[PDB]
Amino acid sequence: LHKEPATLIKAIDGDTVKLMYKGQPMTFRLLLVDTPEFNEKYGPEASAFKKKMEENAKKIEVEFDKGQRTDKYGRGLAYIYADGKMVNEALVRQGLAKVAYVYKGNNTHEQLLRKAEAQAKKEKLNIWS
Numbered sequence: 001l002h003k004e005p006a007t008l009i010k011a012i013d014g015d016t017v018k019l020m021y022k023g024q025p026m027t028f029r030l031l032l033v034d035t036p037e038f039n040e041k042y043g044p045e046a047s048a049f050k051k052k053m054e055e056n057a058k059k060i061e062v063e064f065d066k067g068q069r070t071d072k073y074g075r076g077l078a079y080i081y082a083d084g085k086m087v088n089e090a091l092v093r094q095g096l097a098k099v100a101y102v103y104k105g106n107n108t109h110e111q112l113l114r115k116a117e118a119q120a121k122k123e124k125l126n127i128w129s
Ligand SMILES: Cc1cn([C@H]2C[C@H](OP(=O)(O)O)[C@@H](COP(=O)(O)O)O2)c(=O)[nH]c1=O
Pocket: 029, 030, 031, 032, 033, 034, 071, 072, 077, 101, 103
Protein backbone atom coordinates (compact mmCIF):
# COMPACT_ATOMS: atom_id res chain seq x y z
CA LEU A 1 0.00 0.00 0.00
CA HIS A 2 1.03 3.54 -0.78
CA LYS A 3 0.23 6.93 0.71
CA GLU A 4 -0.98 9.59 -1.79
CA PRO A 5 -1.59 13.29 -1.34
CA ALA A 6 -4.88 14.96 -0.65
CA THR A 7 -6.08 18.29 0.86
CA LEU A 8 -8.88 18.78 3.32
CA ILE A 9 -12.00 20.41 1.92
CA LYS A 10 -14.40 19.87 4.78
CA ALA A 11 -15.03 17.79 7.87
CA ILE A 12 -18.22 15.86 7.75
CA ASP A 13 -18.49 13.43 10.63
CA GLY A 14 -16.75 10.69 12.62
CA ASP A 15 -15.86 8.52 9.66
CA THR A 16 -16.36 10.62 6.49
CA VAL A 17 -14.51 13.71 5.21
CA LYS A 18 -14.43 15.74 1.97
CA LEU A 19 -10.94 15.79 0.44
CA MET A 20 -9.48 16.95 -2.81
CA TYR A 21 -7.78 13.89 -4.34
CA LYS A 22 -6.01 14.05 -7.74
CA GLY A 23 -7.52 17.50 -7.96
CA GLN A 24 -11.18 16.45 -7.59
CA PRO A 25 -13.52 16.79 -4.62
CA MET A 26 -14.55 13.47 -3.13
CA THR A 27 -16.13 12.19 0.02
CA PHE A 28 -13.96 9.56 1.75
CA ARG A 29 -15.27 6.87 4.13
CA LEU A 30 -12.65 5.44 6.50
CA LEU A 31 -11.90 1.76 5.99
CA LEU A 32 -12.48 -0.80 8.73
CA VAL A 33 -14.29 1.46 11.21
CA ASP A 34 -17.69 2.64 12.38
CA THR A 35 -18.26 5.72 14.47
CA PRO A 36 -21.56 6.58 16.17
CA GLU A 37 -23.83 8.84 14.14
CA PHE A 38 -23.78 12.49 15.28
CA ASN A 39 -27.16 11.80 16.96
CA GLU A 40 -25.87 8.81 19.13
CA LYS A 41 -23.69 8.51 22.25
CA TYR A 42 -20.04 9.51 21.44
CA GLY A 43 -21.11 10.71 17.94
CA PRO A 44 -20.30 14.34 18.57
CA GLU A 45 -16.99 13.39 20.27
CA ALA A 46 -15.97 11.16 17.34
CA SER A 47 -16.76 13.91 14.84
CA ALA A 48 -14.85 16.43 16.86
CA PHE A 49 -11.87 14.23 17.32
CA LYS A 50 -11.66 13.49 13.61
CA LYS A 51 -12.25 17.16 12.64
CA LYS A 52 -9.45 18.39 14.91
CA MET A 53 -7.00 15.79 13.76
CA GLU A 54 -7.58 16.54 10.11
CA GLU A 55 -7.83 20.38 10.31
CA ASN A 56 -4.67 20.63 12.50
CA ALA A 57 -2.69 18.45 10.05
CA LYS A 58 -0.13 19.98 7.80
CA LYS A 59 -0.34 17.06 5.43
CA ILE A 60 -3.28 14.78 4.80
CA GLU A 61 -2.71 11.55 2.89
CA VAL A 62 -4.94 8.82 1.56
CA GLU A 63 -3.99 5.17 1.29
CA PHE A 64 -6.18 2.83 -0.67
CA ASP A 65 -6.25 -0.87 0.11
CA LYS A 66 -5.92 -3.67 -2.45
CA GLY A 67 -9.61 -3.96 -3.28
CA GLN A 68 -12.60 -1.69 -4.02
CA ARG A 69 -11.62 2.05 -3.97
CA THR A 70 -15.12 3.51 -4.08
CA ASP A 71 -18.24 2.17 -2.43
CA LYS A 72 -21.76 1.92 -3.76
CA TYR A 73 -22.41 5.55 -2.81
CA GLY A 74 -19.28 6.82 -4.70
CA ARG A 75 -17.34 7.40 -1.48
CA GLY A 76 -13.67 6.79 -1.57
CA LEU A 77 -12.56 3.96 0.74
CA ALA A 78 -9.20 4.58 2.32
CA TYR A 79 -6.96 4.80 5.32
CA ILE A 80 -6.47 8.49 6.07
CA TYR A 81 -3.29 9.90 7.66
CA ALA A 82 -2.83 13.27 9.38
CA ASP A 83 0.90 14.16 9.58
CA GLY A 84 1.67 10.39 9.27
CA LYS A 85 -0.77 9.30 12.01
CA MET A 86 -3.63 7.06 10.82
CA VAL A 87 -7.00 8.62 11.65
CA ASN A 88 -8.79 5.28 11.40
CA GLU A 89 -6.45 3.82 14.04
CA ALA A 90 -6.59 6.89 16.31
CA LEU A 91 -10.38 6.86 16.45
CA VAL A 92 -10.31 3.14 17.41
CA ARG A 93 -7.50 3.65 19.97
CA GLN A 94 -9.58 6.35 21.63
CA GLY A 95 -12.72 4.32 21.97
CA LEU A 96 -14.49 6.59 19.45
CA ALA A 97 -14.93 3.94 16.70
CA LYS A 98 -15.34 0.20 16.56
CA VAL A 99 -13.57 -2.05 14.05
CA ALA A 100 -16.30 -2.84 11.51
CA TYR A 101 -16.98 -3.36 7.83
CA VAL A 102 -14.06 -5.76 7.39
CA TYR A 103 -14.41 -7.09 3.88
CA LYS A 104 -11.98 -9.68 2.48
CA GLY A 105 -9.38 -8.05 0.25
CA ASN A 106 -9.73 -4.56 1.72
CA ASN A 107 -8.50 -5.47 5.17
CA THR A 108 -4.74 -4.85 5.21
CA HIS A 109 -4.81 -2.91 8.55
CA GLU A 110 -7.33 -5.16 10.32
CA GLN A 111 -5.06 -6.55 12.92
CA LEU A 112 -3.46 -3.17 13.68
CA LEU A 113 -6.91 -1.74 14.33
CA ARG A 114 -8.14 -4.71 16.41
CA LYS A 115 -5.09 -4.26 18.63
CA ALA A 116 -6.04 -0.60 19.12
CA GLU A 117 -9.61 -1.60 19.92
CA ALA A 118 -8.39 -4.09 22.55
CA GLN A 119 -6.30 -1.39 24.20
CA ALA A 120 -9.25 1.02 24.19
CA LYS A 121 -11.55 -1.59 25.64
CA LYS A 122 -8.99 -2.58 28.33
CA GLU A 123 -8.79 1.14 29.27
CA LYS A 124 -12.57 1.40 29.28
CA LEU A 125 -12.36 4.45 27.02
CA ASN A 126 -15.39 6.25 25.73
CA ILE A 127 -17.60 3.69 23.89
CA TRP A 128 -16.12 0.98 26.14
CA SER A 129 -16.77 2.99 29.35
C1 LIG B 1 -16.78 1.20 5.38
C2 LIG B 1 -17.55 0.58 4.21
C3 LIG B 1 -18.93 0.80 4.07
N1 LIG B 1 -19.58 0.30 2.97
C4 LIG B 1 -21.06 0.46 2.85
C5 LIG B 1 -21.72 -0.65 3.68
C6 LIG B 1 -22.91 -0.01 4.31
O1 LIG B 1 -23.97 -0.15 3.36
P1 LIG B 1 -25.48 0.30 3.86
O2 LIG B 1 -25.57 1.80 3.63
O3 LIG B 1 -26.33 -0.42 2.90
O4 LIG B 1 -25.67 -0.03 5.27
C7 LIG B 1 -22.50 1.45 4.40
C8 LIG B 1 -21.99 1.82 5.79
O5 LIG B 1 -21.50 3.17 5.81
P2 LIG B 1 -21.89 4.19 6.95
O6 LIG B 1 -21.43 3.65 8.29
O7 LIG B 1 -21.16 5.44 6.58
O8 LIG B 1 -23.42 4.35 6.96
O9 LIG B 1 -21.38 1.62 3.54
C9 LIG B 1 -18.90 -0.46 2.00
O10 LIG B 1 -19.57 -0.96 1.02
N2 LIG B 1 -17.57 -0.66 2.08
C10 LIG B 1 -16.89 -0.23 3.18
O11 LIG B 1 -15.67 -0.51 3.24
